[PDB]
Structures are given as structure tokens and as C-alpha cells.
Design a protein around this ligand. Structure first.
Ligand SMILES: NC(=O)c1ccc[n+]([C@@H]2O[C@H](COP(=O)([O-])OP(=O)(O)OC[C@H]3O[C@@H](n4cnc5c(N)ncnc54)[C@H](OP(=O)(O)O)[C@@H]3O)[C@@H](O)[C@H]2O)c1
Ligand SMILES: NC(=O)c1ccc[n+]([C@@H]2O[C@H](COP(=O)([O-])OP(=O)(O)OC[C@H]3O[C@@H](n4cnc5c(N)ncnc54)[C@H](OP(=O)(O)O)[C@@H]3O)[C@@H](O)[C@H]2O)c1
Ligand SMILES: NC(=O)c1ccc[n+]([C@@H]2O[C@H](COP(=O)([O-])OP(=O)(O)OC[C@H]3O[C@@H](n4cnc5c(N)ncnc54)[C@H](OP(=O)(O)O)[C@@H]3O)[C@@H](O)[C@H]2O)c1
Ligand SMILES: NC(=O)c1ccc[n+]([C@@H]2O[C@H](COP(=O)([O-])OP(=O)(O)OC[C@H]3O[C@@H](n4cnc5c(N)ncnc54)[C@H](OP(=O)(O)O)[C@@H]3O)[C@@H](O)[C@H]2O)c1
Lengths: 234, 245, 237, 240
């Protein structure tokens, strides 16, 4: 049985990913933040809907926290085959008004997490000669993003990580890809810039991610998969 | 019942696409070239494997041939919901040695087909407010390739077409995407000398193997599904790590 | 003394390119279309402003025409070191309404020119181990554009050509690059075009020509196979 | 008289940039690292070569250091029109062997610098309605970079910053661009010959002065319509 770990797995996109991977037959572990005030509630509602998840506290901005979390996940599941680096935040401000704290918080959570989280699971994937690592970027890592110098930098940086790790793991049965969603239903200045004329559904993005985590996607690696309603093309 | 039309549907990649779309529950029409000498045999083997396809002659480089083909497809199936522009050829030569015929043949088959084929089915998709158009590009459109000034140009041009048509159709429930494969296990690869396969082709591919047509077909089947309506104007790279950007 | 040949050298962008290359010290030849009705007027006014150009008729959509043109250029200048594939047209229509003639006209002029024109000058560049080939694309090849299924495809295809020819010529001292301008002040802008341009103005042909002059210089030999975007921020990726 | 500030202005690429901008007629200030032990000698040699530079200590990974540096630069020159974010380092390791220290050192120097340095100069450029901000990326922010998960992430992140700042400043006569050099003649010969040069179509390393010449064009009055762009100068090593 394939094991998936989804950071931010109780958030808007993360919950959709977790449900799709569970329905594809994977055993699914989710992370939750230290500040999360609804861990037991979320698990109960998912169980009522027919899905048993296990949850693990983590601060993806903190390497030692990721170590403690990974120890628990691996103790319970024995391995992680599929890693979704989905946790993320924004701290929007014009560059002129942006604080060092705004910058750092986004950098540490959205980009350092690539190192902090993936370091804990990569050795096992390499040892077993199988893995799927999916890093959640953003259309605003590609298009210019007003008021988001920190978020755009972190999200663009994610794809540099994806490409390096893809090259390093390509002969070990692992793929590493970036999925860059557009704006999700999770907005009178946004909708006009989306050609399909609607926000994206988290379940749609989750469906693409489930394909990438499947046995049919072993030839997709180092790629950036854009699912943005046409908002950005290049 | 969703209807798909796959150009080059009996070729290496096209056959894999046709099978995947059929297995997803679509009614599948395939094109074949006018001089294809094995059409009945191909249909019989697919029937033996449990899949009934209907096959239609076309020259995708010729607008009138595409018109005649589409007339017959629509007479049998009533509509086309899913169009896979997959037919394609190469005519490799260094630019110094490339002929006018080499250039025109690749441009007309590989790029003009975007116009010649898609024009025959776009109106119905627009009126029904649903469609999936998938154009097969190439990793060599993205990175360029020695000996392929014609082919890389045509394959790069395909994505310009994809982006424009995506913009024009986005409010009609249609998506238009480019799929750009790396080297695949088909006949083009199988005609390569073994030493060239080993020393020149495989070292280009980080995952260390050619891609299977069925893998590319699986990605295309996702794009043609009801879960991919938010993917449009994209270029989806499935190349084993051969190219990243 | 480097020789440049600029197709569409008398048009909006082409004239600015020709002036910049001349001012960089090159001997400049320009093409003109077969029915251009102001060739001698243009040449005289450029001479009045201090620049002696020579002009040559061509149809870049026709291989034979390009043969004849290159024959005349090479007879007068001896060689061509720098080739600017700048001639281009649009034939806008929604895809639903676009005709085969709309498609073919843009494809043959804008994309086939890569073959028809460059085939006539590539051998000399390879023989001399020096060359600069600059192909004019468009921001609309990068982002796609309503009504331009033909033009966006042709302009996107140009960069596929650039990358391949760059690979084939890189060990022979030749560079091949695409320059993709945004909307230019050439011959409703406040409501339709300008709001899409972050810098809030159209581009000047001379600005694009200045970038091209850099790419054609001895300082740009490490730029090849690139697509240089000069679009006022209209498209980023 | 246009004023330029070049971080890492005494390094391999940075010195070539500083010379080109000086020769274009700009007044040029360069940064140096805090423990750079050859500031006086470097300045003297440039002076003997006919170029008067002013040098300033900074740690681009530290916001307060950037503040002190910028205040002294602005006191001496009155303004900065042209900012070259060129300081940078590598800490190469395979991902399996890479430490948090390797990652943080590259992130803070190569990516946080975009914030730490540019924050000190942006207000003046906005007020004067002129600016050129050029951020030095890398071909390895575009192509896959084996053994450089940290450096590739930092360099790719730079272009996200470029594009945002380009959008926010475009109406104020400021351009912001990424320049992404390939491998430069600034490593064992066996690695150069087996791993690097075969992947560069032109078959040679780039010269720092070549990259500096492109940067000089981008900082000129002819480049005001180039913004939010990534300008690749890599010998053909990466195309897309
Ligand atoms: N929403 C969109 O339109 C959109 C578009 C493109 C990309 N994205 C990306 O999609 C991802 C998911 O975001 P979302 O839209 O689902 O927003 P969301 O509902 O706010 O979810 C963000 C998730 O991040 C987790 N998280 C944040 N900081 C964390 C930390 N330090 N340690 C551990 N977990 C942390 C949260 O955990 P808890 O729930 O446990 O507190 C939460 O589940 C993000 O990477 C975002 O950048 C979103
Ligand atoms: N193979 C790879 O490594 C690779 C990699 C990237 C992209 N691609 C693309 O994948 C697509 C399919 O190629 P393939 O590898 O499957 O090669 P293939 O086996 O040679 O198939 C090419 C197909 O094109 C059809 N065709 C060619 N010219 C035609 C014309 N004028 N009118 C109608 N049909 C025509 C052929 O039809 P008949 O069989 O009926 O004669 C054939 O089915 C092409 O677009 C190719 O560029 C291939
Ligand atoms: N203007 C913009 O906003 C813009 C933006 C991006 C890209 N571009 C590109 O810039 C280039 C120059 O166009 P422009 O803006 O300067 O427009 P333009 O003034 O209309 O110039 C087009 C040029 O193409 C030449 N030409 C057209 N068809 C030809 C043919 N079959 N054979 C030979 N010459 C032919 C014309 O020659 P004659 O003058 O001799 O008749 C003319 O000089 C084009 O490639 C265009 O796509 C323009
Ligand atoms: N060399 C290449 O092949 C190549 C290719 C692509 C991109 N690049 C980029 O080009 C830029 C310049 O590097 P280079 O090739 O010239 O290498 P270099 O000779 O090692 O110079 C790096 C520069 O960074 C400065 N620096 C490092 N950490 C600093 C800090 N914390 N605070 C202040 N200054 C600091 C150094 O200052 P001091 O000299 O004062 O100590 C030095 O001038 C870097 O961004 C690099 O990533 C280089």
C-alpha cells in the first residue's frame, strides 16, 4: 500500500489532495500546524465521510520540527512513498511597505520547507527506488505578482528545487514536479484575468496531482504543470 | 457519449492515445494516411483486443482533404468533443543541406494541420460549449535540435497556436493544450542504430529509458477528462527530465 | 567592416534597426517589398540625415525571390555578416472566421522567411566563422493573442528556428537569437493597448534597434538561442 | 551623472560590471564583504588603470548592515540610480548530503539580498522617477542543476522578485531585470572538460566583460522598455 504525506493536508487545497490520494488507494498522513485549533474536528468529519486519516503536528519552517514529525509518521506507516509539499502562507505588501518579518515568514514557510520537509523522507525513497514528490507552486511564481515580492520569490524558488531534485533522483525511480495552480475557490480584479471565467476548484488540482503520483507519470519529472485557467501562458 | 478524433491514430503514439480514450468510455474515430496499407489489419487487431474503432482517410496537410474527412466523421458520430492533433512527420537535415521540400513537407503536415484539422471541428465545440483540443508538440520544439530546423520550428509554432485558441475558446467550455513528449519507444527510435541509441539518445534522458506511448496517452486522457477544465493554454512536458526550464 | 542585411529595412522597426547598425559602423543593405512605392524617396531622406543605404527588392515568402535578392546583395557587398529577419505581416481574424489565405499569407511571410532568407546567407557566415542572425518575434508569440492564431503560431515557430540554428552554428562563431518586442510606436490605445503595458507607453522602434545593435556586436558572442523580451512588462514568465 | 552601486563589485563578475558602468560615464560605488582583506590594493590597481571607485563594506545577508552601507553610499553620492545585485555564493552538495547551514547560507546571501539591499535604495528611485535594478541570476536557475538544490532555488527565486518589483515600479521610470549568465571564466580541468564545456554550444566559458556589456546596455537610456525580463547570456547552454 502506497503511503502519502500531505503537508497542510487540512487546508483548502490540502484536504482536496488528501481525499483524492486516499480514494486512489493510498494510506494518507496529513500534517497540521501548531496553531491548528480544529485537528480532532477535521479528522472526525473526514471519518464520517468514509476516510481515515492520521495527523501529525509540524512547523515546516523549522528543521527540527520536521524531524520530530517525520519520526512519528515513519513509526506509524513504515515509509512515505508520496510527499506533497503543500503547506504555504502569504504576507502581502507592496515592496515599499514590506517588512523584513513579512519577507522572512514567507521565505521560511514556503521555500525553506522544501528543504526542511523533503530531507526527512528522501533517503527512504532512494533506498526503495520509488517516490513521488510534488511541490505546490503558484501561477504567481510565473506571472508578475503585485504586492507579493516575497511570495513570488518563494514560489519561483520552489521550481529551482524541483528541477535539481528531479535530476538527482531520476535514476532512483523518483519523480519531482511543481504544480502551479491559479486562483482557487478555497475577486472582482482577479476573475477578469482568468480566461475560463471562474476560479479553480481544489478538487481539480488534486486530480492532476493524483495523476502525477500514479504509476502512469514516471516519465514526468522536473516539470512545472500549470493549472491556472489560462491566467498565465508562455 | 463523448466522441474523440485522433489524427495519426494508428501510429506509435496515436494508437496508444486511441486505446486510452476508448478505455475512458469515449467513442473513438482515428485517421489514417491515404496510402496506409494496413488499415484493415490494424482495426482487426484492435477488435481482437476488444476495441472497435472507426477509421477515416485524411491528408492533414490539405484543407480540402480535412473537410472531406470531417464530413464522414461527423456523419457517423454526429459531433467531435475531443480532438487530438497527433499526426506528424520529420524530414531531418542540417540547415546547410535542408531542401525546400524538406521544409515545406514538415511545415504543412506538422503546423498547417493545426488550421486544416481544427477548423473542421471547432464550430461544433463552440456551439455545444464543450471541447478538448490537445496538440502534440515535442521536447525538440522547446530546446531546439540539430538537424531539425523545420521540425523544431513547426513544433514550437504549435504552442503559439495552442495559446491563441485557448484564449479564444476559454469561455466556451473548451480547453486547448500542448503535450510535449521526450523520446518515445516507437518506430522512429527503433530505426536508429544500436550504438547511436546507446551513446547519443539514452544519455540525454535522466530517467534512463525511453517514454512509453501509453504514458503520454495516460496524461492526454487526464487532459480530456472532466477534471482538467482549468488546464488551458499550457505546455505539459513529459520528457523523462530531458528538458527543464 | 561588417555588412548587415535588414529585411523590411524601410518599415517602422526596420528603419530604426538599419540606422542603429549603420551608426555602429556597419555597411547596411535593406530589403524592400516588390510594390514599395517610395524606395528612392526613403533612400534620399536617409542620405540627407547622413546614412548611405542600398536597397534590394524581395518577397521573403518566395525562395526564388530571396535567391535573386541575395545575388544582388552579395554582388555589391561581397558578404553578409549580420542578418536581421525583420519583414513581417499580420492577417488578423478570429479562428472561427480565419481563411486558409489568412493563415497561409502570415505563415509564408513570417515563418517561411526563416528558411527562404537565411538559406541564402548562412554558407558565407559558416565559411568565415562569424555571423549574427537576429529574428524578430513578438510578445504575442509568447502570450498568444485574440485574432492571431496565424501570427502567434508563426512568431512562436520563429523561436524554434532560432534555437535549432543556434545549436547548429555555435561552434562556427555565429549567434542566432530572437528579439520579441511588445507594442511599438509604429505607423483607442488608451483603453485597449496601453493598460496592458506596465510602463504605460508604447515602445520606441529605436529602443528595440538599440538592443539588436548590442546583439550584433562583438560583446554578444555568448548570447545564442535566446529570446530577448522587450515588451514594457506586458509579458513576464 | 548617473550613480551605480554594484554589490560584490570587487569579485569576478562584479569588477567587470563596475568597469563597464564606469566607462559608460557613471559614478560607481562598489560593495565589499566585511572581511575582504584587499580593499586598498584593489582600489589602487583600478586607479592605476584609470578608474576611481569608492568602496563600502556590507553583508548582503543582514538587513541592518545593508542599512548602514546604503546610508553611507547615499551620503557620499546623494542618490543611487543603478543597483546591481551581484553578490552571491555557492555551497554545493547533493541533496542527501546538504546541511541546513549549506541551505541557509545560500538562501540568505543569494535571495534575501534582493530584499535587504534593494529596500535601501528603492524609495529614492521612485521619488526621482528613474531606476535600473539588475539582479544577477544564473543559467542554473533555469536548467536542472545537479548538486545545487540551494543555489538553484535561490537563483530561480530571484526572477520571481524581479517580476514583482518590475510590476510595482513600472510607472516610475524604473526597470527591474534578471541577467542569467552561463558558466564564466572567473574547478578541476577534468570537470570543466567532462561536465561543463560539452554542454555549452559555443564551446567556451563566458567572459565577465561580455556579461558586463549586456548589463551596461540594460542600465542605459535605451533599455527603458525592457522590464521584468530574464536575459540569458549562457553560450546556448540553456534554451527554452
Ligand atoms: N488558494 C489558492 O488560490 C492557491 C493558488 C495557488 C497556490 N496555492 C498554494 O496552495 C497551498 C495550499 O494553500 P491553500 O490555498 O490550501 O490555503 P490554506 O487553506 O490557508 O492552507 C495553507 C496550509 O498551510 C499550512 N501551514 C501554513 N504554515 C505552516 C507551517 N509553518 N507549518 C505547517 N503547516 C503550515 C496550514 O496548516 P493548518 O491548516 O494545519 O493550520 C494550511 O493547511 C499553498 O502552498 C498555497 O501557496 C494556493
Ligand atoms: N516518437 C517520439 O519520440 C516523439 C516525441 C515527441 C513528439 N512526437 C510526436 O508524436 C506524434 C506521433 O508520432 P509517432 O512517434 O507516433 O510517429 P509515427 O508512428 O510515425 O506516427 C506519425 C503519424 O502521422 C500520421 N501522418 C503523417 N503524415 C500524415 C498526413 N499528411 N496525413 C495524415 N496522417 C499523417 C501517420 O499516419 P499513418 O500511420 O496512417 O500513415 C502516423 O500515424 C507526432 O506529432 C510526433 O511529432 C513523437
Ligand atoms: N510594430 C509592433 O508593435 C511590433 C511588435 C512586435 C513585433 N513586431 C515585428 O516587427 C517587424 C517589423 O514590422 P513593423 O512593426 O515595422 O511593421 P511595418 O512598418 O508594417 O513593417 C513590416 C515590414 O515587412 C516588410 N514586408 C512585408 N511583407 C514582405 C514580403 N513578403 N517581402 C518582403 N518584405 C515584406 C515591409 O516591407 P516594405 O516597407 O518594403 O513594404 C515592411 O518593411 C515584423 O516582423 C513584426 O512582426 C512589430
Ligand atoms: N562565475 C560564474 O560562472 C557565474 C555564473 C552565473 C552567475 N554567477 C553569479 O555572479 C555573481 C558574482 O559571482 P562571481 O562569479 O563574480 O564570483 P566571486 O568572484 O566569488 O564573487 C562573489 C561576490 O559576492 C560577494 N559576497 C559574497 N557573500 C557576500 C555577503 N554576504 N555580503 C557581501 N558581499 C558578499 C563577494 O564580495 P568580496 O569579493 O568583497 O568578498 C564577491 O565579490 C554571483 O551572484 C554568482 O551567483 C556567476
Amino acid at each position: 500500500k502506497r503511503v502519502a504525506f500531505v503537508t497542510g493536508g487540512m487546508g483548502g487545497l490540502g484536504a482536496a489532495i488528501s481525499r483524492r490520494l486516499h480514494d486512489a488507494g493510498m494510506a494518507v498522513a496529513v500534517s497540521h500546524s501548531e496553531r491548528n485549533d480544529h485537528v480532532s474536528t477535521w479528522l472526525m468529519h473526514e471519518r464520517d465521510a468514509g476516510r481515515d486519516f492520521k495527523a501529525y503536528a509540524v512547523d515546516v519552517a523549522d528543521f527540527e520540527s520536521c524531524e520530530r514529525c517525520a519520526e512519528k509518521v515513519l513509526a506509524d506507516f513504515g515509509k512515505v512513498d508520496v510527499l506533497i509539499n503543500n503547506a504555504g502562507i502569504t504576507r502581502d505588501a507592496t515592496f515599499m511597505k514590506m517588512t523584513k518579518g513579512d519577507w522572512d515568514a514567507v521565505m521560511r514557510t514556503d521555500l525553506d520547507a522544501m528543504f526542511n520537509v523533503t530531507k526527512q523522507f528522501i533517503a527512504g525513497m532512494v533506498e526503495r527506488r520509488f517516490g513521488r514528490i510534488v511541490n505546490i507552486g503558484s501561477v504567481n511564481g510565473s506571472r508578475g505578482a503585485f504586492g507579493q515580492a516575497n511570495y513570488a520569490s518563494a514560489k519561483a524558488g520552489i521550481h529551482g528545487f524541483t528541477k535539481t531534485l528531479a535530476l538527482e533522483t531520476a535514476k532512483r525511480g523518483i519523480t519531482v514536479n511543481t504544480v502551479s495552480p491559479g486562483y482557487l475557490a478555497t475577486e472582482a480584479k482577479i476573475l477578469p484575468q482568468i480566461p475560463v471565467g471562474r476560479l479553480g476548484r481544489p478538487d481539480e488540482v488534486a486530480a492532476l496531482i493524483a495523476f502525477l503520483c500514479s504509476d502512469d507519470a514516471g516519465f514526468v519529472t522536473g516539470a512545472d504543470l500549470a493549472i491556472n485557467g489560462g491566467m498565465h501562458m508562455s
